[PDB]
Amino acid sequence: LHKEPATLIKAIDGDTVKLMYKGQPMTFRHLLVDTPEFNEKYGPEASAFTKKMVENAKKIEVEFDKGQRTDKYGRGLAYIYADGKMVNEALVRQGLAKVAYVYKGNNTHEQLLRKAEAQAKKEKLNIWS
Ligand SMILES: Cc1cn([C@H]2C[C@H](OP(=O)(O)O)[C@@H](COP(=O)(O)O)O2)c(=O)[nH]c1=O
Numbered sequence: 001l002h003k004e005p006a007t008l009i010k011a012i013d014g015d016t017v018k019l020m021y022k023g024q025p026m027t028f029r030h031l032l033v034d035t036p037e038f039n040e041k042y043g044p045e046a047s048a049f050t051k052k053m054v055e056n057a058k059k060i061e062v063e064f065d066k067g068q069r070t071d072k073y074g075r076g077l078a079y080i081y082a083d084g085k086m087v088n089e090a091l092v093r094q095g096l097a098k099v100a101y102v103y104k105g106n107n108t109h110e111q112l113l114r115k116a117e118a119q120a121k122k123e124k125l126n127i128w129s
């Protein structure tokens, strides 16, 4: 996989963000995770965590996996990096997302994220408390 440039347009919620990618505005959904909706428990905390990570970043990058690059809603499907730190992993490691939506062929970082979830769960963080 390869990281590609993008710039933040605006934070949306814990697992979606609006980025400019190849010069076009797109909503990106983070691969392999599920955050609570803003109206659900830890939803606002997940939204605030993602917002902080992407807004504070000097460099955003997107990395598509091997499979589908957009979903049925036209959202980009990618791993999102903020100054080299993967947001998808960071949310799981903080107990603010569950590993989820693991589809064959877009699951390159599944083991990495499951390791993060196990750590969050052992720590009883947030969703795991
Ligand atoms: C993360 C992800 C979601 N989706 C679709 C499945 C779910 O369809 P349904 O909308 O029919 O439930 C929806 C979940 O996204 P959200 O968690 O953003 O709601 O997005 C994909 O198709 N591929 C993916 O990799």
Ligand SMILES: [Ca+2]
Binding pocket: 015, 034, 035, 036, 037
């Ligand atoms: Ca969600």
